[PDB]
């Protein structure tokens, strides 16, 4: 039972950047493949970014591609998210997750995912 806390989120401007950081506790960060998704106000968990178990593979959203950037560090058991040239229209909850298959190394669906974070509130003012 990994455990997983999401922080570094915040109110900013556009055009600024952000770094967000999931924190994972219990397990080691290693056995995971992991995975930022975002919920915007009246929509689904929309996926934005993954990193497999290797940090080999590192997937991206088409919205967010060339902006963000996912990122593991061993040390401090942590996945982060950076987010430059942030909108308006990236204001959301932003989660991280776990692949709860070692089947899928890449996966889009928020049903391939679990032991969800608690979120970290990022908004973007004009």
């Known amino acids: 039972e990994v455990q997983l806390v999401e922080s570094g989120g915040g109110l900013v401007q556009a055009g600024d950047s952000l770094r967000l950081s999931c924190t994972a506790s219990?397990?080691?960060?290693?056995?995971?493949?992991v995975a930022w998704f975002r919920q915007a106000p009246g929509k689904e968990r929309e996926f934005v970014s993954v990193?497999?178990?290797?940090?080999?593979?590192?997937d991206y959203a088409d919205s967010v591609r060339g902006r963000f950037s996912i990122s593991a560090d061993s040390a401090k058991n942590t996945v982060y998210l950076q987010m430059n040239s942030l909108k308006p229209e990236d204001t959301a909850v932003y989660y991280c997750?776990?692949?709860?298959?070692?089947?899928?190394?890449?996966?889009?669906?928020?049903?391939?995912?679990?032991?969800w974070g608690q979120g970290t509130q990022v908004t973007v003012s004009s």
């Open positions: 219990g397990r080691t960060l290693g056995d995971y493949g």
């Open positions: 997750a776990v692949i709860a298959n070692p089947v899928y190394a890449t996966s889009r669906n928020s049903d391939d995912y679990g032991h």
């Open positions: 990193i497999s178990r290797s940090t080999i593979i590192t």
